[PDB]
Amino acid sequence: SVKSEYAEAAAVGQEAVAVFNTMKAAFQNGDKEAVAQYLARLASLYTRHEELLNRILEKARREGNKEAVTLMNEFTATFQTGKSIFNAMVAAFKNGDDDSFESYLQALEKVTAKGETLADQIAKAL
Numbered sequence: 001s002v003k004s005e006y007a008e009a010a011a012v013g014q015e016a017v018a019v020f021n022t023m024k025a026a027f028q029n030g031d032k033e034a035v036a037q038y039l040a041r042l043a044s045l046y047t048r049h050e051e052l053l054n055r056i057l058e059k060a061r062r063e064g065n066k067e068a069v070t071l072m073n074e075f076t077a078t079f080q081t082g083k084s085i086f087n088a089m090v091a092a093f094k095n096g097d098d099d100s101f102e103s104y105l106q107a108l109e110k111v112t113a114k115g116e117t118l119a120d121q122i123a124k125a126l
């Protein structure tokens with residue numbers, strides 16, 4: 001069902017939460033070799049999450065589930081704000097700019113926490 005597909009998407013989202021918090025700790029500790037690996041793992045995860053979200057949105061559209069489509073349009077747009085901040089973060093790591101890395105990391109956390117009520121609303125609407 002589209003609902004069970006969203007729960008699978010929700011799990012991938014929580015995996016990225018776990019890998020992110022770990023990567024944050026590594027960054028604070030200066031373990032750049034770990035950070036690089038966690039950033040690669042996160043990029044794969046966000047690619048998977050985005051795709052599951054697009055398939056869910058497309059299915060809700062084909063189903064005519066107007067409320068779920070509205071919420072998923074809002075949620076995917078925000079997802080892309082998270083994705084842009086993540087990519088800037090990756091560039092800051094490449095460039096050795098720890099000040100920008102810290103900034104983007106905090107921003108990504110705040111964009112994510114904000115989008116959490118909407119994430120739960122989607123589960124109920126699908």
Ligand SMILES: Nc1ccc2oc(=O)ccc2c1
Binds near residue numbers: 081
């Ligand atoms: N909430 C959130 C946080 C980080 C993210 O990074 C990405 O690369 C794509 C989406 C995304 C969403």
